[PDB]
Ligand binder design. Structure first.
Ligand code: SF4
Lengths: 97, 53, 69, 155, 170, 113, 317, 83
């Protein structure tokens, strides 16, 4: 259990390092954001399973629904960015300076 | 109700299914050509040949 | 005619009636004339674990009725 | 004896290719109708197990039908080169054999022999659907009587 | 026997590749490898509903996330994990950092995190043996009855999500 | 058990890929490995940007999949004791989903742009 | 157990090969052909020769493709298509999952992931068109299909697959749930890409879709996976909706009745393939979100109300 | 009052799927309010044994809580065994 939970904390620290930098695309950053969705589901379900607090099983479906709904909002936000630009890149977005 | 039973049960698609069900129970129109050869004509022009008297 | 498709459909029916009958017969031969118990809940798994510990030869399927008691 | 085992494995590997060979949903001509007439249920492809797939990566034999013009020539060689390595070519009809009409035209490649190898020349303007169904029988016996694993063995 | 630790190291590898950020078409492949890993982790832990539910919701979301990668955010010459050599050197550096982290983590702590014959024994804490409801399905069934505000706020999130997405994409 | 069935399926399909690749003869060249598009080389690169035409109906496919994962515990929520508030909650959220799809149906974004 | 693995995995391959044979024969007799008569006694040795042609032909290694996804998509496609059979009930299953309906749903979407990775990493414009109409096809089918499986398992209270046959011991679920049954048969046609709802394999608007650049070998192994999915969801519709009479003393009689019913359902599947014309990716999405999703939301409404109106609350096991 | 009937029959003839869906939706809304078996579902979900209802201590006080399990006292199930 503490090896699994500390490696999930390492996976969140790695995906923090992933979404806290930008290589070429905003969409790989949004894939890192959905990696945070999956990592928080696995962490919440592992916590509820080993604590056996089955009354808090409404919480990880609420994690998935709210975080994947804001992920879907950002996916169509990238659709509107590529519609209003024609490009997609991180360096394209320097017009607000 | 006849139009609303044509839609939502798709009974004309069931009618097309019955059409194909009527055609699957037929002895088929194929011939087995290396053993059952084709219908032709006496005027069927084919390989060129020189005749003889 | 209509009886032309039915040889290939009949060997299709034989070769697809063979895995369900084969898995029922291999479950009967695995569990010794009995069928394999299904653990939908934890109570059935503890029931099968207690069945193994009552039989004592690390076996679920053999069981101690009133011949031991 | 090992040569008997090699020739029976050669017959077992050529029986599959002579039976379940998969042609091409081609076109181009008058001769496109007679490929559709070999698909038609009087003289039938699918009785032999001869199936019109559309993709060149999935095809096994190319039925070149009719005229092969100068614009159609890279559009025939590109397709044959993207056929995978058992590639057999039927040439339906006299315009794919040697240019039946339009031999002396400005824009017909004079037969399909100028571009790809053709393993069987089926003549006519109609090859009848039974006549190149005979042609698929003769290619079927040709790659029955070919010897691949035998000359793999004696080499 | 070491199923959850082997799967969690594979989750660390998959989230490391997603963190090292390829073309996001390949990132969807790496994240769905991590999704299959997490579904198998919850099904090996005892959540028979939650892993397959995240596999259904994640395969169905990530399908059209993958379609948006290959439509909108694509590139003529993309970067996989083996294309760019700084990404490949960072991949082997993260792999040797992970095994150096476990090689220092079985030695520094002197507690039961990693032991070569004593890991996996502290995984199942307590499930009831004679009890009948121990799977995760009935607890998330209870949000219809006890925790009704969760379903109120999730249905309002999806209703507002439909209206918000029509207003974004208009 | 199921891990061993998944791994023997891996071994069977990997054995089928190995017998598909290594046993047939193969010579490969540049025109053979040229990508197929109708018998000519492609006009642009094949990973050139698609302008997506089902984008808002794609996002409501995603959000409808979140709703059906919300609705997945309901076969065990039918066994609950507070069945009046269970059926009222199921009624109000299927009414929410039908009203959202009715809004999208009236706004006519089901058609592509 | 491995004997059961081999004797369940070999004759399902023989069964889907004979399903391709009776596809060619049943479409032939529909289309007034005779079907592949000349090889074998009546056709039996045709699909063994089709596998022995398509696996002794070579595949491509194209420049434009990505080679790792090129070799890792079809090994997935055969693994997931042969692994949906392991929670299927029969009399007694090879593996009894606790909740197997979600496994069927998720790994059936993962088959479309194998198709979708083929469509992108095949790297043609035709293959990218096939990948995005796979995306639009699953946009059409998936929410509808899971609402159907949810709204029928409001009558059988667990997600288990043996609970379906102990629910359907007395009557079939065709008779209480025929508005579920017609749209489920249509939605599983949309799942398994058959000729009304076959886009993404295409063959009449585009050239091949997901297997444009996929030559023999991996195209054959996709073909293996696709017809394994055809006989799979035929058997799944057969067990879930017209599930036969179940006798605990005689499981083999029920298995013979299930296989006569499954060959009737597979003949209905190929009969639908050779009876209807083909959809469009716009009209497919249009009526599966317009003429299906209000109707299956209302059927979800009515089967939510069905443990309240007639007071049939289903048991757990 | 003919306009609503003409619109209903026109939608019934043209696009009857939304008419059938709204009718089945309103039937599922109103049919628990009509049916008398709504109150039996909570009776079923209460009277199922699902855990152990534990014995209680006694000082000779309550007569309704029985001692033998086959006593006539307590909540019986003649509305479930016979019905
Ligand atoms: S060979 Fe004859 S029939 Fe065929 S295209 Fe030429 S002219 Fe027409």
């Amino acid at each position: 259990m503490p090896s699994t939970f500390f490696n999930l904390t390492m996976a969140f620290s790695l995906s923090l390092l992933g979404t806290l930098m930008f290589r070429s695309h905003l969409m790989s950053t949004l894939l890192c954001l959905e990696g945070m969705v999956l990592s928080l589901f696995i962490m919440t379900s592992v916590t509820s399973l080993n604590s056996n607090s089955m009354s808090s099983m409404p919480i990880p479906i609420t994690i998935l629904v709210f975080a994947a709904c804001e992920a879907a909002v950002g996916l169509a936000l990238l659709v509107k960015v590529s519609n209003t630009y024609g490009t997609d890149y991180v360096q394209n977005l320097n017009l607000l300076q | 109700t006849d139009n609303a039973a044509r839609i939502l049960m798709w009974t004309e698609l069931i009618r097309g299914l019955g059409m194909t069900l009527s055609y699957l129970f037929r002895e088929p129109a194929t011939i087995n050509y290396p053993f059952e050869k084709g219908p032709l004509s006496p005027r069927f022009r084919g390989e060129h040949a020189l005749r003889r008297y | 005619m209509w009886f032309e498709i039915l040889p290939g459909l009949a060997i299709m029916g034989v070769c697809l009636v063979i895995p369900g009958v084969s898995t029922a017969y291999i479950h009967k031969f695995t569990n010794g004339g009995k069928e394999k118990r299904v653990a939908r809940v934890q109570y059935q798994w503890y029931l099968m674990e207690r069945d193994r510990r009552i039989s004592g030869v690390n076996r679920y399927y053999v069981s101690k009725g009133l011949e031991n008691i | 004896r090992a040569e008997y085992v090699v020739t029976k494995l050669d017959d077992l590997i050529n029986w599959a290719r002579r039976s379940s060979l998969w042609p091409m949903t081609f076109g181009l001509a008058c001769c496109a109708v007679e490929m559709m007439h070999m698909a038609a249920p009087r003289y039938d492809m699918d009785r032999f197990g001869v199936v019109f797939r559309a993709s060149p990566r999935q095809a096994d034999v190319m039925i070149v039908a009719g005229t092969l013009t100068n614009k159609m020539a890279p559009a025939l060689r590109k397709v044959y080169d993207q056929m995978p390595e058992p590639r057999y070519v039927v040439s339906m009809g006299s315009c794919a054999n040697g240019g039946g009409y339009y031999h002396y035209s400005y824009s017909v490649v004079r037969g399909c022999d100028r571009i790809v190898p053709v393993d069987i020349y089926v003549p006519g303007c109609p090859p009848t659907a039974e006549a190149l169904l005979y042609g698929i029988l003769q290619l079927q016996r040709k790659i029955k009587r070919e010897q691949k694993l035998k000359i793999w063995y004696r080499r | 026997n070491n199923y959850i630790f082997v799967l969690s190291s594979l989750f660390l590898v998959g989230c490391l590749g997603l963190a090292l950020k390829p073309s996001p078409i390949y990132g969807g492949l790496g994240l769905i490898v991590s999704g299959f890993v997490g579904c198998l982790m919850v099904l090996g832990f005892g959540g028979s509903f939650l892993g397959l539910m995240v596999f259904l919701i994640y395969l169905g979301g990530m399908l059209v996330v993958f379609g948006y990668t290959t439509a909108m955010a694509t590139e003529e010459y993309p970067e996989t994990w083996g294309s760019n050599w700084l990404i490949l050197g960072f991949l082997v550096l993260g792999v040797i950092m992970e095994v150096f982290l476990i090689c220092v983590l079985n030695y520094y702590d002197e507690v039961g995190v990693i032991n070569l014959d004593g890991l996996g024994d502290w995984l199942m804490y307590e499930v009831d043996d004679v009890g009948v409801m121990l799977e995760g399905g009935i607890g998330v069934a209870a949000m219809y009855s006890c925790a009704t505000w969760m379903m109120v706020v999730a249905g309002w999130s999806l209703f507002a999500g439909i209206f918000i997405i029509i207003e974004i994409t208009r | 058990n199921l891990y061993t069935v998944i791994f023997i399926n891996i071994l069977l399909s990997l054995t089928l890929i190995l017998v598909a690749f290594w046993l047939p003869q193969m010579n490969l060249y540049s025109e053979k490995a040229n990508p197929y598009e109708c018998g000519f080389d492609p006009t642009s690169s094949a990973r050139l940007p698609f302008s997506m035409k089902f984008f808002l109906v794609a996002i409501t496919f995603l959000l409808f999949d979140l709703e059906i994962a919300l609705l997945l515990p309901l076969p065990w929520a039918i066994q609950t004791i507070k069945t009046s508030t269970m059926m009222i909650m199921a009624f109000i959220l299927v009414t929410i989903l039908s009203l959202g799809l009715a809004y999208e149906w009236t706004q006519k974004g089901l058609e592509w742009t | 157990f491995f004997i059961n693995i081999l004797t369940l995995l070999v004759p399902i391959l023989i069964a889907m090969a004979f399903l391709t044979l009776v596809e060619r024969k049943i479409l032939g007799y529909m289309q007034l052909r005779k079907g592949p008569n000349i090889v074998g006694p009546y056709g039996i040795l045709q699909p063994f020769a089709d596998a022995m042609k398509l696996f002794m032909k070579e595949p491509m290694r194209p420049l434009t493709t990505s080679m790792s996804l090129f070799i890792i998509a079809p090994t997935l496609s055969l693994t997931l298509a042969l692994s949906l059979w392991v929670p299927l009930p029969m009399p007694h299953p090879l593996i009894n999952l606790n909740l197997g309906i979600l496994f069927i749903l998720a790994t059936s979407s993962l088959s479309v992931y194998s198709i979708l990775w083929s469509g992108w990493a095949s790297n043609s414009k035709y293959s990218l068109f096939g990948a995005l109409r796979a995306v639009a096809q699953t946009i059409s089918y998936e929410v509808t299909m899971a609402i159907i499986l949810l709204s029928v398992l409001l009558m059988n209270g667990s997600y288990s697959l043996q609970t379906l046959i102990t629910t359907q011991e007395h009557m079939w679920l065709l008779l209480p749930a025929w508005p579920m049954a017609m749209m489920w048969f249509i939605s599983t046609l949309a799942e398994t890409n058959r000729a009304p709802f076959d886009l993404t394999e295409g063959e009449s608007e585009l050239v091949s879709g997901f297997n444009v650049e996929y030559a023999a070998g991996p195209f054959a192994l996709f073909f293996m996976a696709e017809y394994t999915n055809i006989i799979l969801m035929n058997a799944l519709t057969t067990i879930i909706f017209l599930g036969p009479l179940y006798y605990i003393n005689l499981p083999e009689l029920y298995s013979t009745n299930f296989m006569m019913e499954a060959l009737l359902l597979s003949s209905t599947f190929l009969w639908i393939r050779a009876s209807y014309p083909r959809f469009r990716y716009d009209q497919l999405m249009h009526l599966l979100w317009k003429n299906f999703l209000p109707l299956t939301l209302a059927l979800c409404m009515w089967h939510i109300s069905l443990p309240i109106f007639t007071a049939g609350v289903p048991p757990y096991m | 009052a003919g306009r609503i009937s003409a619109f209903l029959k026109n939608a019934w003839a043209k696009e009857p799927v939304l008419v059938v869906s709204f009718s089945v939706w309103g039937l599922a809304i109103i049919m628990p309010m009509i049916s008398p078996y709504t109150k039996y579902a909570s009776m079923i979900n209460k009277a199922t044994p699902y855990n152990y209802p534990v014995p209680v201590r006694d000082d000779g006080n309550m007569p309704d809580v029985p001692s033998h399990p086959q006593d006539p006292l307590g909540p019986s199930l003649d509305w479930l065994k016979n019905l």
